[PDB]
Design a protein around this ligand. Sequence first.
Ligand SMILES: CC(C)CCC[C@@H](C)[C@H]1CC[C@H]2[C@@H]3CC=C4C[C@@H](O)CC[C@]4(C)[C@H]3CC[C@]12C
Ligand SMILES: CC(C)CCC[C@@H](C)[C@H]1CC[C@H]2[C@@H]3CC=C4C[C@@H](O)CC[C@]4(C)[C@H]3CC[C@]12C
Ligand SMILES: CC(C)CCC[C@@H](C)[C@H]1CC[C@H]2[C@@H]3CC=C4C[C@@H](O)CC[C@]4(C)[C@H]3CC[C@]12C
Ligand SMILES: CC(C)CCC[C@@H](C)[C@H]1CC[C@H]2[C@@H]3CC=C4C[C@@H](O)CC[C@]4(C)[C@H]3CC[C@]12C
Ligand SMILES: CC(C)CCC[C@@H](C)[C@H]1CC[C@H]2[C@@H]3CC=C4C[C@@H](O)CC[C@]4(C)[C@H]3CC[C@]12C
Ligand SMILES: CC(C)CCC[C@@H](C)[C@H]1CC[C@H]2[C@@H]3CC=C4C[C@@H](O)CC[C@]4(C)[C@H]3CC[C@]12C
Ligand SMILES: CC(C)CCC[C@@H](C)[C@H]1CC[C@H]2[C@@H]3CC=C4C[C@@H](O)CC[C@]4(C)[C@H]3CC[C@]12C
Ligand SMILES: CC(C)CCC[C@@H](C)[C@H]1CC[C@H]2[C@@H]3CC=C4C[C@@H](O)CC[C@]4(C)[C@H]3CC[C@]12C
Ligand SMILES: *[C@@H]1O[C@H](CO)[C@@H](O)[C@H](O)[C@H]1NC(C)=O
Ligand SMILES: *[C@@H]1O[C@H](CO)[C@@H](O)[C@H](O)[C@H]1NC(C)=O
Ligand SMILES: *[C@@H]1O[C@H](CO)[C@@H](O)[C@H](O)[C@H]1NC(C)=O
Ligand SMILES: *[C@@H]1O[C@H](CO)[C@@H](O)[C@H](O)[C@H]1NC(C)=O
Lengths: 344, 344, 344, 344
Amino acid sequence: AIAQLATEYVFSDFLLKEPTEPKFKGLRLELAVDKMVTCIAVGLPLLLISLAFAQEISIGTQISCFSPSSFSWRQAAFVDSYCWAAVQQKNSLQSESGNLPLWLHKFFPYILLLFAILLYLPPLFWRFAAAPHICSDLKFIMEELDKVYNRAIKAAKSARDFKYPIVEQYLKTKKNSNNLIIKYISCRLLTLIIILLACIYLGYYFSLSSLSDEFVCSIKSGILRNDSTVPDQFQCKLIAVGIFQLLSVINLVVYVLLAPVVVYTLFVPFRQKTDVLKVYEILPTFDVLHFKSEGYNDLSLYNLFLEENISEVKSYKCLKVLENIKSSGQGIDPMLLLTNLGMI
Amino acid sequence: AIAQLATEYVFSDFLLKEPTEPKFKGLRLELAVDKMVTCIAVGLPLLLISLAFAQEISIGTQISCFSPSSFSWRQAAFVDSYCWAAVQQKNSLQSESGNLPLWLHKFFPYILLLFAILLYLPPLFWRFAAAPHICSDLKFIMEELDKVYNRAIKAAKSARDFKYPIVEQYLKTKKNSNNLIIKYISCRLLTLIIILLACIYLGYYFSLSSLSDEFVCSIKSGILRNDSTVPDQFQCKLIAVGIFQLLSVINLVVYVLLAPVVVYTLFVPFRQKTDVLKVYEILPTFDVLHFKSEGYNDLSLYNLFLEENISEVKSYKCLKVLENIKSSGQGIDPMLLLTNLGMI
Amino acid sequence: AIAQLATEYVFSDFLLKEPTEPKFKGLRLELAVDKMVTCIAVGLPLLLISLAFAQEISIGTQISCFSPSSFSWRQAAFVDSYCWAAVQQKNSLQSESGNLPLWLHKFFPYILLLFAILLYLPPLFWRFAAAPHICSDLKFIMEELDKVYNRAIKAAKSARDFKYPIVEQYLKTKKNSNNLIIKYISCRLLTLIIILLACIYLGYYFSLSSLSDEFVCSIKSGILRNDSTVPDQFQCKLIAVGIFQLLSVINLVVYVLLAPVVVYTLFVPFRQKTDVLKVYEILPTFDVLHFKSEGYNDLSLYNLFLEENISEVKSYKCLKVLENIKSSGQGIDPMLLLTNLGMI
Amino acid sequence: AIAQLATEYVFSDFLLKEPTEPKFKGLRLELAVDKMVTCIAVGLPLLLISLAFAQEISIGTQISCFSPSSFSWRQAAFVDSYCWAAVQQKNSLQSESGNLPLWLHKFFPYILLLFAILLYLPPLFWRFAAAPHICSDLKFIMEELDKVYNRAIKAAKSARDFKYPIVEQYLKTKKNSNNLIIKYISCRLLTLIIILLACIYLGYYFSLSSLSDEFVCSIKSGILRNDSTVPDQFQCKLIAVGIFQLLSVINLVVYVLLAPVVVYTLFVPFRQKTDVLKVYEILPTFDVLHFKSEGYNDLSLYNLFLEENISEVKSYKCLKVLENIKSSGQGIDPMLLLTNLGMI
Ligand SMILES: CC(C)CCC[C@@H](C)[C@H]1CC[C@H]2[C@@H]3CC=C4C[C@@H](O)CC[C@]4(C)[C@H]3CC[C@]12C
Ligand SMILES: CC(C)CCC[C@@H](C)[C@H]1CC[C@H]2[C@@H]3CC=C4C[C@@H](O)CC[C@]4(C)[C@H]3CC[C@]12C
Ligand SMILES: CC(C)CCC[C@@H](C)[C@H]1CC[C@H]2[C@@H]3CC=C4C[C@@H](O)CC[C@]4(C)[C@H]3CC[C@]12C
Ligand SMILES: CC(C)CCC[C@@H](C)[C@H]1CC[C@H]2[C@@H]3CC=C4C[C@@H](O)CC[C@]4(C)[C@H]3CC[C@]12C
Ligand SMILES: CC(C)CCC[C@@H](C)[C@H]1CC[C@H]2[C@@H]3CC=C4C[C@@H](O)CC[C@]4(C)[C@H]3CC[C@]12C
Ligand SMILES: CC(C)CCC[C@@H](C)[C@H]1CC[C@H]2[C@@H]3CC=C4C[C@@H](O)CC[C@]4(C)[C@H]3CC[C@]12C
Ligand SMILES: CC(C)CCC[C@@H](C)[C@H]1CC[C@H]2[C@@H]3CC=C4C[C@@H](O)CC[C@]4(C)[C@H]3CC[C@]12C
Ligand SMILES: CC(C)CCC[C@@H](C)[C@H]1CC[C@H]2[C@@H]3CC=C4C[C@@H](O)CC[C@]4(C)[C@H]3CC[C@]12C
Ligand SMILES: *[C@@H]1O[C@H](CO)[C@@H](O)[C@H](O)[C@H]1NC(C)=O
Ligand SMILES: *[C@@H]1O[C@H](CO)[C@@H](O)[C@H](O)[C@H]1NC(C)=O
Ligand SMILES: *[C@@H]1O[C@H](CO)[C@@H](O)[C@H](O)[C@H]1NC(C)=O
Ligand SMILES: *[C@@H]1O[C@H](CO)[C@@H](O)[C@H](O)[C@H]1NC(C)=O
């Protein structure tokens, strides 16, 4: 039913499932905006496919040819099925709009499924190629941040009663390499191109005259070519073509609204803001150097992933509340850190 | 069946599922009133869609055109399907009420699903954008309250046998920022606007003459335009239009009753009452300062979320019972706190 | 529905399920490229089979013979079923394209299923014959790497405050044996041959005239051979043949794009690059000798499997970050290793 | 659907499920070749049964008798059902090929299911009679091997810083008894005989003229015997007989390819090679005596089961890597064993 399709595709965790494995425990591995874009671009065409053939919106068979009254039920069924299979056969049918509109009307669900698959492909390539590496690197970075926070609080407590910046060096090294950012931009660009092509196709499909679904059909090949009792042609109409056009314009609207989001996603350096690591600069055990901005490198992408999935880090949360309290400046950062006692 | 739909949509945890993740363990992340509003506004139109096409209420096909007796079954089926697809084609049909009523009668389930999706969108935006931040902040606040309660009871026990207000400073800082409250008000306002538009549409749909479902249909395009055996027109009726109007007025009543709730929700400062933190003011380790009221800021929203999901805090429950006992004044707050022995 | 099939076969973990057993905990046991190739080559033909007979794309029965009007419904049904069963019987039918096109049109789903099964066979043979051995060997190798890393860090810590290369000897011994690599190459080659044969078949099927689906059928055997009221022949058409050809060309395109991937897979020594063990050469407890390259031996395959599933090793990750930091050369490898404190 | 059947029967763990009980944790209890043979021989005929009546390959009803035009739909249905039930009644029908072909055409699914059940019976008898005993014995043997390995490594460590061969005596005793091997050979031989009988039946079924499915049917018993309006006979055809023959030849090919595998399985002593226990002979605590070869006794079968499910033993894996390293001979077996430190 329509409501069942809605529950499956919008109100359920459709493509929102976290990786089912212990390797990525709590790691999104995909930005929220990218996940939203993929979920829409994939589950919208599927939802429209399901809707267009819902038991309520669908009168019945997808084509009716209006055989003569003399024709029996199965003769008329032969006519309808023959014309359905003959939309491909150009000789059989003669339609003013041509045969491409008939092909599109017959295979619209296939085309929507193709667009959905093509849009799901780049996210899958990301999740299967560049996701494990970033997951491992980000897990190491979070562990290092937790360890340095613990060491700093222990030092502060000892004072009240190595020291090498490994994480900073690793981030600096990531500043050079750009394979991950190149893959990310390539997959986003392919998604954008697929969306644009889908928009072109949907606009063309919705621009039809709405009468191209009606085509003339001739079961006059073979032994029936010279038969007399059979009329030279029939009036066939492809039902649900109006529904297809409505859903196609809906998908076109959604995709044109979505494309600016993908373009904004492509410009990762601009998105790289609100320095996540700036909060850690007040730790004595952490060097006061952010050095993450203004670069078409994997460093900006790692900064984005950190700003996305750093809320799960207790040390980061503690430092964030310390920073927020520092806005008033009533107290002292080391005193607040010592009082917090948030090692684990 | 009707009962199955009821069990799925009203008697089950439809959209009442808690976040399936360890990050939010026991945190609602959504006020009870907001959750009720979203659940109604989403699962009502879906329930009505399912009901309108239930196997019992539905006689059968959604349109019947009453072809002549001479017409065969599949000729009549062609007529019915053609008219169903031609509700869009204005030239084919001539109805007194126009063609918009026919469009609405055909696509009412789609319109209800659209309203449900549009009403579910703002809650989803909230849960995916502003929910993680408030979850982390509120978890930190609850942990700080538990820790300060433990410290105060330990101090009392030591007396019988830092001290910095970090949580108060954090709340004071939240008094300034307003991004969360702005997002909350924006999503509530969008929900209200969607509800009002849905009410307008449902009132228009229910105000129809009830005879607009009957339209005249002409299969007279193409080779059949000059055919003689076919009548110039047919009498088609869109079945289930009365059911659609009944369910639409039901949804209109529900939404007009719900809109005052959304308006009341918009005025969060008025809702900010029954100070949750007032109970903690009797703790020696906690400063006697509430400072949370009369502000279009995130502080009021945090106060609401606390008053919502603070019952899970054992320290808060203990302080609440101490406060309630203090109404009589027979005993002493520190003595009762020491006797409680409710560290964990 | 079409969307359900898509969810099952592309958006779900179809053939992507990890081995359901404690023996292989986190071990892929199959390279990512090989898994992708198998998943495509298997779940594409199945998806096309499901699509070709979807409730929306399918008009109805797969063959209609257009019995005379005098014929009753069940007489026409007998004609259709007889011709469906007589596509095999060459005498009954006379078609210009022959009888092989009719066989193919009738049994296309069977042929796609056969290709899917034949393509799934070599992966299954691998997973049931050569997977347990490589799993055990690789688990031992990872355990040895973890143990040597722990020993080296313990030695470094002791200095700050046996020694036999068992793993290196085992890898060197693997350099000689080649049964695993021979099995891998044989299964890949069989997969490639099956893909090529499938491409040949699909090209032949798509090269048909598109009118071979229309064949002449004669129910004139037995008592009906000399019957007069029955016409000497009927015009039968195999519906969905156009859909079969469309999906067959789609599968042909996918398989021709996939075959280069399989050919590249066959050349494992070229794939053996980015020495995984090179990072471990900086450990005092590990001998400085890689000795893994330029060989049609199981050593290259083991190197590939290591480069695939070594990210799960904490010691390997730590050594990798040490290597990446060494690019700048600011610090010292032993000092960084001591500071890391990543025993477990 | 066809793809669903494929997923259930070839791509899923059909009859590949490990024993669902804690008694056999990780013990196959069935050789890989035997499991493959059983899985094929059982799930192939079931798959063919499901395929032959798939919603796509099946035109409709399994028999059509071509009643006269004067006959009504339910008169024709009576004719078809009567002939379907009268394939057994020899007097009613007169077919050139006889009545056995009609029996076979009607009950082919039953015959395939019978063959599948008969082939599944011997494996079930094994798993319910001789599997628990071998499971217990093999678990004891693995535990003894682990214990002796632990004792030997402990002795080596003590030197660096009872002694009775219970397992060897148990294996020697198993050398005498042969009940398990006799049961194994009997079940394999019964499986082979069932496969041969199935091949005979399938060859006979596929050797039919392909026109035996067409039989003459006479509804002329009872009050209708002397009725005039009813024709003396009808032309009935059993649909799907061609599909049955195709699938039967497929099953015949599979079974003839499989029978050599079963014959090779029967010769267990030849399969008994690559002495698993030879690796343990280098342990000081283990006597240097294999004494397992060249015997129609349970010892060879136990050797096969060990070679199958010994990879799960850490001590065996360690000894195997020690053996492989000994190929070069660079080091010493006791030194390598001491350095390994693989007690558990
Ligand atoms: C997804 C991508 C590939 C879709 C590409 C656009 C498709 C949907 C449409 C939009 C405009 C279309 C073209 C418009 C006009 C003509 C001229 C005609 O004489 C032949 C077909 C041809 C050349 C059409 C082919 C298909 C076409 C290119
Ligand atoms: C992503 C955005 C830009 C998509 C907007 C849809 C655009 C591309 C659509 C809307 C209307 C469409 C046009 C409608 C009609 C025709 C006439 C036909 O003979 C050739 C294609 C052509 C000229 C179409 C080309 C594509 C088109 C311009
Ligand atoms: C969800 C929102 C967009 C719904 C908006 C209201 C819809 C349901 C209805 C209510 C009143 C309607 C209008 C009433 C009268 C007319 C005048 C007529 O000559 C053209 C249509 C037009 C202009 C209608 C368009 C659709 C309309 C605006
Ligand atoms: C949220 C609350 C206010 C909704 C209450 C429903 C109201 C808005 C409904 C109920 C009856 C409706 C009217 C019924 C009939 C017509 C005549 C038509 O030619 C134009 C629209 C118009 C004038 C409708 C406008 C909307 C309407 C006034
Ligand atoms: C999967 C593998 C086995 C498929 C092999 C190719 C199949 C699909 C096709 C492609 C070309 C075909 C051949 C083309 C021409 C002829 C000549 C004709 O007089 C008899 C059939 C015969 C000999 C065909 C047999 C089937 C054939 C070989
Ligand atoms: C893997 C790649 C190479 C596959 C590409 C498809 C090729 C092999 C296909 C496409 C068109 C096909 C041809 C189409 C028509 C005929 C005529 C027929 O009488 C014999 C087979 C023959 C000659 C086919 C042989 C195979 C063929 C050449
Ligand atoms: C599974 C086992 C039992 C199958 C045994 C073979 C079956 C399928 C077939 C193969 C050959 C067949 C026989 C061939 C010829 C005749 C002679 C005829 O006048 C009576 C039936 C009889 C005697 C057939 C009986 C059934 C038969 C034995
Ligand atoms: C396991 C292997 C050997 C099976 C190979 C199938 C063999 C046994 C099949 C293939 C063709 C079959 C023959 C086909 C036709 C007839 C004629 C009939 O009047 C008696 C049975 C008889 C003589 C069949 C006996 C069995 C048969 C020889
Ligand atoms: C049909 O009859 C015409 C008469 O002109 C003839 O040309 C044609 O070949 C016939 N077709 C068939 C299929 O017999
Ligand atoms: C139908 O016949 C009329 C007669 O006036 C003619 O004008 C019209 O073009 C014909 N239509 C078709 C589709 O042939
Ligand atoms: C049909 O009648 C013809 C007349 O020539 C005869 O040859 C043939 O044998 C008959 N067929 C049957 C099945 O009785
Ligand atoms: C049918 O009529 C015949 C006439 O010869 C007679 O012999 C036979 O008994 C009748 N059968 C029945 C069932 O009445």
